[PDB]
Design an enzyme around this catalytic site. Structure first.
Site, PDB file in Angstrom:
ATOM      1  N   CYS A 197       0.806  -1.193   0.000  1.00  0.00           N
ATOM      2  CA  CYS A 197       0.000   0.000   0.000  1.00  0.00           C
ATOM      3  C   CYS A 197       0.854   1.264   0.000  1.00  0.00           C
ATOM      4  CB  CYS A 197      -1.016   0.035   1.127  1.00  0.00           C
ATOM      5  SG  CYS A 197      -2.590   0.792   0.578  1.00  0.00           S
ATOM      6  N   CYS A 236      -0.242   3.928   1.457  1.00  0.00           N
ATOM      7  CA  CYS A 236      -0.749   4.597   2.632  1.00  0.00           C
ATOM      8  C   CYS A 236       0.325   5.353   3.396  1.00  0.00           C
ATOM      9  CB  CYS A 236      -1.530   3.670   3.542  1.00  0.00           C
ATOM     10  SG  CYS A 236      -0.973   1.986   3.884  1.00  0.00           S
ATOM     11  N   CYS A 278      -4.429   6.163   0.530  1.00  0.00           N
ATOM     12  CA  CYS A 278      -4.173   4.856  -0.052  1.00  0.00           C
ATOM     13  C   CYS A 278      -4.379   4.890  -1.567  1.00  0.00           C
ATOM     14  CB  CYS A 278      -5.072   3.797   0.585  1.00  0.00           C
ATOM     15  SG  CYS A 278      -4.982   3.757   2.398  1.00  0.00           S
ATOM     16  N   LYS A 291     -11.801  -6.070   3.064  1.00  0.00           N
ATOM     17  CA  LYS A 291     -11.366  -5.132   4.101  1.00  0.00           C
ATOM     18  C   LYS A 291     -12.507  -4.138   4.368  1.00  0.00           C
ATOM     19  CE  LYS A 291      -7.508  -2.138   5.379  1.00  0.00           C
ATOM     20  NZ  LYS A 291      -6.072  -1.802   5.174  1.00  0.00           N
ATOM     21  N   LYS A 333     -10.677  -8.976   6.851  1.00  0.00           N
ATOM     22  CA  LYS A 333     -10.278  -8.141   7.999  1.00  0.00           C
ATOM     23  C   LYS A 333     -11.185  -6.946   8.168  1.00  0.00           C
ATOM     24  CE  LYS A 333      -6.482  -4.784   8.595  1.00  0.00           C
ATOM     25  NZ  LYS A 333      -5.372  -4.161   7.811  1.00  0.00           N
ATOM     26  N   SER A 364      -5.495  -4.842  15.057  1.00  0.00           N
ATOM     27  CA  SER A 364      -4.957  -4.263  16.277  1.00  0.00           C
ATOM     28  C   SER A 364      -6.061  -3.815  17.226  1.00  0.00           C
ATOM     29  CB  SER A 364      -4.057  -3.063  15.936  1.00  0.00           C
ATOM     30  OG  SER A 364      -4.849  -2.010  15.407  1.00  0.00           O
ATOM     31  N   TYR A 411      -1.092 -10.628  16.285  1.00  0.00           N
ATOM     32  CA  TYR A 411      -0.063 -10.085  17.162  1.00  0.00           C
ATOM     33  C   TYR A 411       0.144 -11.014  18.361  1.00  0.00           C
ATOM     34  CZ  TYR A 411      -1.011  -5.808  14.484  1.00  0.00           C
ATOM     35  OH  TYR A 411      -1.162  -4.901  13.458  1.00  0.00           O
TER      36      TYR A 411
HETATM   37 PB   LIG Z   1      -3.595   1.373   3.063  1.00  0.00          PB
HETATM   38 PB   LIG Z   2      -3.973   5.037   5.463  1.00  0.00          PB
END
Ligand SMILES: [Pb+2]
Ligand SMILES: [Pb+2]
Ligand SMILES: [Pb+2]
Ligand SMILES: [Pb+2]
Ligand SMILES: [Pb+2]
Ligand SMILES: [Pb+2]
Lengths: 328, 328, 133, 328
Positions: free
Chosen positions: D133, D135, D143, D210, D249, D276, D315
């Site tokens: 990405c 981002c 993005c 997503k 996700k 997260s 994680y």
């Molecule tokens: Pb992104």
């Molecule tokens: Pb972003």
């Protein structure tokens, strides 16, 4: 004497007792696959070129031919009543605007485009759907660009349709609903939007299933009320071509077809359209006291929701935004 | 000047051209999964206890309350026009025949049984379907045999229903259509017929899907117009219980449900019923010139056939036996 | 005796209370046991008492076990996805009018199976106190 | 006295007894469609441009912002504990590296590429997955590559994404997971790899589903938590476009969607990602003693496996590589 005979039964099977699932008035809310809310209703609008217009149309309707200067009053009450969307239908009455190519269609100074700019400013909340057809902007009045004293010249009419569609979207309309039935016009309108980088903001709401019957007006490419196999191939076609949503019309008389749409175009919002004929039919029936309008409006509109639809284009919008507020 | 823009297209996909399959008037006959014939039409009859009766009922109807002595004239023309079946509804008007158990229901000297014997002799060609309900033979008027100042006493009402059902069949009726909605009445009526060795000659035509709306009469166990899941469990239930055919009602407003019946009860003849409300609604609409009756009758009735049905209970039978004969 | 649940008895006792509630005026009875065959029995009981056409049997067809009720009997394994389908399919045939899935958030996939299996039955989601807290 | 009433039952149906299939602790291993092993766990890594970094991030995390010189110690223990894979996320902190085209993205001297070369040498066993990405490498932080003071310029951003994707793979990364949601980026990344003859060694692990919620960070193209129909059309789309695996996700809150992926992308490994937010939510809950972390970690992670997934980006990897070793 003739005495009542009573046969001898067997103990009630547990699998014959569904009754307890629809006994309380709340369980008939619990049994609905989907409840009718206000953000489902889509109000059609006939924006006239005479900025002061507000001419009542008719067959049994209570709808009109409004103009860009009466617009802020008509819409205002409704919107406050929680109206979320409207589908624009332009009506050019000027003495010299129709013609052999519906040129005046995407006319920057037309009812529709001068209606799409009005809303985006005086009511930025509203969601704009624009019908896309050359029906009302052509001299002949045909739905497409014709060949020599015959039929519609496909490619041309299509090349012209995608044009208007992107012009609307460039003007500020959120959605474009092509009501043509001319083969392959979604692939083309989809591309057009793409080239114009407007494909990620415009919602292609196709009229995948538009049949022909005495319900639009009393008495071109338009499906046979019996062709149930075509309506499936046409739905499956517009879906692959890029349609984001599908419209079924008429509605009440094509509930089974709304059912096919629900299975075929399962991941696409299905929209039900209550054609003016049905609208003017519920009304006429109501006046002759055959049924209570309000009673027949819900039944008929929840059938849309039951049958498969999650959106509804109806003239009974004014009335529903009222009704839906109610409780006892 | 505002000039017509025309986007630049791609060569027509072969999979966007369905058009050539519904272009000639004969291809709209070729596109129908099923054509409307006369042996599909089922004419309802309200046989009164007054042997000279012929009282017009109404809401917009042209149907009546006939009696066993006017019967040979009403039926005769129709039958010659090729009528193949009728569904009897008895109307006892005598001052002392209704009561706490609809005893007069299977009454050997009643409108229905004295109607079933008339036909089997003066018209041995006809096929007889009898509605089976205690609605019209009970003092309270409820569809079943009631408990203390409340609800229907299931088992009893059912024990009583199977009784009448077999009595009709013993009288000479070919088919028995129970219009109750009282859980498990098909298993019981089926058994009853079995015990009476009449299961191999009687056709159990169940009202598997009877909903509730403003279409019977203006303004008991009866499904919620929105409960689409119940209607499937009820269809699937009557099918296993022995139903030979299934009736959907109302019709036009439940075309999607006629669609579910077609998939669920696939090997069973599906019957569409045009409730008097819809009938009186097409008519009222026709008088207020919202639509041409004949135009809306076919559309609406071919929707039954498209939607799934191969049989039709309608009051427009007199008119169809005419129409169907026509060509141009 | 100093062990397990005596099925039949516990069930014979459950249907009892279920009909008693309904006789008292309750519209719906949701059995949260997980003891095999308690819907067929509660359904019959209501039937004998002529209360089957007014009571809504809202079964806890899929009740799993996890740290979400209270921190730290018959109760399905959070992983047994095949049992939860056989149990849903079982209560549906036994007469359940509606089905409850619980917990909820952690069993969304199982709520998905219920939606396909018990398609003509209202599916109910339960946000267990653990998820809530 | 109020005595316990006990209704009278029927002999236990054999089809009501499932109990014996989940009674012993080993049968709850036997009832799992799939068991949680260590080669399923995928550890994310935030490789910083400051080669000495090891800055703790936070919300409830225990994860960090490591650098290429602390890397051999962090990874070493884990890998010995049997870690098989990691998904790299680069974090450029240098004062002048972000910009209008995320140019520094495929930067041969960047955290990610200088992380992909470190691993391939000091830990040739590990399997490398790289998030793809723009981002974190863009000034605006969006993005994709933006248009004039608005939206993402699709084609460009995509033309740029495929670029980085192949650059990573040329660097030595085994898998590339594009976390954009920008339409058609898998077809393009797939082609790119093809042109560069790297399509037979790189595993395209797409973020097909997503959604958007309060679980990434508290409070671009990203699916509506309710749009369940889009998530299916997007999964079905990336699958045909060449995706080798699919990522869902968030995870716990989209278990149903993980279920749809399992049916739609049946022959493709489905990967579950514990965002997260969920991670920091299990933890916060654990501290306030609402639940025992270890207890809620397994439940929540076996739900991934039950729901459909055979891989997991979490994680809690450090902790699982421990736990999984245990017996009693
Ligand atoms: Pb992104
Ligand atoms: Pb972003
Ligand atoms: Pb048109
Ligand atoms: Pb026209
Ligand atoms: Pb009745
Ligand atoms: Pb009645």
């Amino acid at each position: 004497m003739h005495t009542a005979e009573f046969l001898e039964t067997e103990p009630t099977e547990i699998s014959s007792v569904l009754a307890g699932g629809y006994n309380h008035p709340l369980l008939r809310q619990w049994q609905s696959e989907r409840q009718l809310t206000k953000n489902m209703l889509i109000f059609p609008l006939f924006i006239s070129d005479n900025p002061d217009d507000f001419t009542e149309i008719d067959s049994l309707p209570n709808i009109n031919r409004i103009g860009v200067n009466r617009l802020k009053d008509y819409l205002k009450p409704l919107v406050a009543k929680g109206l979320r969307s409207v589908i624009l239908f332009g009506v050019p009455l000027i003495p010299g605007t129709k013609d052999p190519v519906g040129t005046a269609a995407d006319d920057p100074a037309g009812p529709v485009i001068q209606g799409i700019k009005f809303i985006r400013e005086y009511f930025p909340e509203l969601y704009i759907i624009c019908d896309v057809c050359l029906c009302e902007y052509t001299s002949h009045g045909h739905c497409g660009v014709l060949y020599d004293d015959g039929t519609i010249n496909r490619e041309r009419s299509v090349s012209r349709l995608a044009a208007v569609a992107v012009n609307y979207a460039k003007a500020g309309a959120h959605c474009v609903a092509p009501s043509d039935m001319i083969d392959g016009r979604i692939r083309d309108i989809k591309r057009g939007l793409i080239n114009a980088n407007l494909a990620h903001k415009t919602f292609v709401l196709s009229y995948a299933a538009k049949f022909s019957g005495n319900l639009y007006g009393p008495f071109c490419y338009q499906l046979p009320p019996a062709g149930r196999g075509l309506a499936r191939r046409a739905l499956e076609r517009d879906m692959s071509e890029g349609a984001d949503g599908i419209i079924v019309k008429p509605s009440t008389f094509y509930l089974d077809i709304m059912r096919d749409a629900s299975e075929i175009c399962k991941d696409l919002p299905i929209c039900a359209y209550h054609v003016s004929g049905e609208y003017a039919m519920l009304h006429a029936a109501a006046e002759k006291g055959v049924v209570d309008l309000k009673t027949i409006a819900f039944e008929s509109h929840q059938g849309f929701l039951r049958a498969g639809a999650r959106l509804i284009i109806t003239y009974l919008a004014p009335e529903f935004l009222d009704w839906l507020d109610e409780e006892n």
